[PDB]
């Protein structure tokens, strides 16, 4: 019916990072259209984020999480009871990017209608990831 | 583009994300790399066996599409 | 002897699978269902019928001598379908389930998925895509799998999922949660993919853990 | 005299510009009401009430204008 | 006299500006109605009704205008 | 007299402003129709009808205007 | 003299342009209020208050105008 | 006489305002068409047709205007 | 003399156009404030402050105008 | 005579308002083209062609205007 | 002389139109600032600075105008 | 005669309205360019070129205007 | 002569309308810049440059106007 302050839950199929959390102050990610910012009282909404960066500021430091990451792609829901859950395929820290190792044999693609869009997305995210390290 | 990739081709979002990783798999840690693997087998049943091996997983193997 | 060694390695396998479940459980489960329930307008315009035809996807382990769990799954689905026929597509998963269901339900089971190298979310999403393609024929889908509540206790459980067509007709009503960064027309298929994949992934994890645990228990028994 | 009366009547005529702008404001308001209702129908009544509220206030302006007009026509 | 009558007919002419703005408001209103309908068609009638409602009120203004015009032409 | 006729024809000329605003409103309306069609094509017919409806009423205003014009040209 | 009085009353008439623009601003404001309320109804009151606040300030302008009008009518 | 002809030709000149507003409406309409096409290209033809349709109706208004102009220039 | 005073007071009247446009700008600003608040309520105060800030700057214009007016009325 | 020529040349001057509105429409159209291109770059060429089409039709109006101007300048 | 002085002060009055349009532009700018801040609060300061920057440039126009005014009042 | 020259220079002055509308169109165009660039930065150059293209065509109008102006100043 | 000078200075005054429209265009441009920056902050600088570019072109118009103004004031 409503939620005091706010709770976030950030989960990955292989590990859950914040089962539930109030300590964060703000969340910023990038959608296709534009970069979005989620805080408390933010209205209910659905988002789908391509493999961009995800940063969350913490009031209190959380052990083993950095607060700035790179996800491979995710779904984000902001429910009615002031609660946002982030579900991503996989997530990692910017420092482990190990950039300049890209394009090691999967450059090859097939020319169809789908291979074109797939290459488009691949280049977009390669560019984005290169930029993020800076 | 995820939206037009789905609209003008039958590309699921998981497939699009996977394509996106394809170029960057080696930059990522091995922990992430090990998860992005699809290898299974489909058997047709008419009281008989016809066996397809689903390993491509980005093209029309795991997720068929209009564009393919 | 072979029983003891098989049990000992199955112990480690079961440990790994239990850890994987603990980490992967409750990944985006109930989420879309929750948000949908929160939408009152959806509930006003929701189509409320009983599915006449549904599609059953049993989930069994491929390796033999894993215990009586596969037997339980095939027994439940056999009861459910032998009772009334032509109301189920019966897309099986796992070698043992398909093999056990061949003779009892010919012409009901047309294809199955076997020889899964490992469990991961991409794989479960592929399975979700297959079931979704086969879901158009049936007004409901349901999944039968063992639930790993305890190391020595596995309980058969069946989840009910609405198919892509019904899900989309329901989702088009959604208005309390906005979707403009991706448009609603894309977002509905997208969150349907999520909604099916999460359930399938949870099912796979629970089934794997239950398989390993049951194999360990039965190997101890046979050693005894 | 005659010229004062002339400019008086000219102002009384100019009174119709607020009517034009009130019509345009009504159009904009009801366009917003339609789009909002489609976006979230559940609370039509609320929107509806607020919508009607706005329109009332619009015609408040309008009547003021004509008041002014009549005033300057006779004062 | 003649000059007063002249400004009288000029005001009766000025009566046509509200018509212009009502036309533009109608255009905007029906554009909003179109967008709303595309978003969520189910409530055509509601949108439709509300649209017509707004439009009716528009011509209220218009008729008021012409009333004034005739008034100023004869009073 | 002569000046009254002059201002009469001037009003009949001023009659063209509603035409301008109706043209602009039509442009806006059809832009909205285009956008709506792109957002959800399935309901072409509905949009189309509603669009045309609006346009009819627009030129209704316009013709009303010219009516007034002729009146002021001859009355 | 007489001509000064004429232009004085003409200004007092010109006082009606702010009323027109305030009406249009009110329409725009309440359209925005509707859209916002539909997007997030929970804070109607807040929006509502702010809305009314804005409208008050709108008519502030108006009164200033009429003040000026009366001033130039008598000063 | 001379003055009537003067105001006649002045009205014939005023005939160009609808042309301006039709140009602006065309610009807005084609901007909407562009946005719609980008949003959903598959149905270009339909949008295109409707777009052109709209434009015709726009210049319909315009032509009416010039008719009036010539009329008042010669009647 | 009288004619200079006439155009002086006419300008002092023309001073009301900025008031009209400030009213419309206030309406637009508060509509934006409403929409923004609905999008992200947590930082109402900030928006509110900025909103009020804008309005202050708006009335700056207004006062400047009237300043100018009085200047040209007396210089 | 001379006075007719005066109003004739004044109309030929008034011909410049359509040019202004065509400039604004071109700006709006190309803004729409830019936004559309960002939304979906793949079909630049298509948008581009359609864009130019609109602009051509815009200047059609413009030339019509000047045609009228010269006509009214000599008839 | 008298007429030159009249049109001089009339232009100095016309100087108030830029003030009106600057007020409206300020309103629009701060509405955009509000919506932008809601969309992404983290960089308020930047937006804020740019906003104020814009406003400064706005008043540049205004001062230019008044400069011109005084110039034409004395040259 | 002399009066013809007066209206000639008045038209040459009226030539500045297209400049105003071109300025506004440029502002709108570059706002659209900014938004588009943010939406998809990768193709700045393309947008940039198209932007410049639009602006060129804008100033085309402007030059046409002054051409006309000079023409009417000397013919 | 004297009257020619009067209309000359009147045009030099009319030169202020482009300033008003440039102010409004600047407001719109910087609103777009704010929104654009919020959508994608990373490339502020680029937007910033482009923004300033646009603004320069805006005031280009302005200077043209004043050039014209002085020209018509002295030619």
Residue numbers in the entry:
A (entry chain d): 24 to 157
B (entry chain e): 2 to 69
C (entry chain g): 41 to 264
D (entry chain O), E (entry chain P), F (entry chain Q), G (entry chain N), H (entry chain H), I (entry chain M), ...: 1 to 75
Sentences from the paper on this structure:
The F-type ATP synthase (F1Fo-ATP synthase) is responsible for generating most of the cellular adenosine triphosphate (ATP) from adenosine diphosphate (ADP) and inorganic phosphate through rotary catalysis. In eukaryotes, ATP synthases are found in the inner mitochondrial membrane. The type III ATP synthase was detected in ciliates where it induces tubulation of the cristae membranes. In this study, we present the cryo-EM structures of the type III ATP synthase dimer and tetramer with associated lipids from the model organism Tetrahymena thermophila in complex with the natural inhibitor IF1.
Using masked refinements, the resolution of different regions reached 2.5–3.1 Å, allowing de novo modelling.
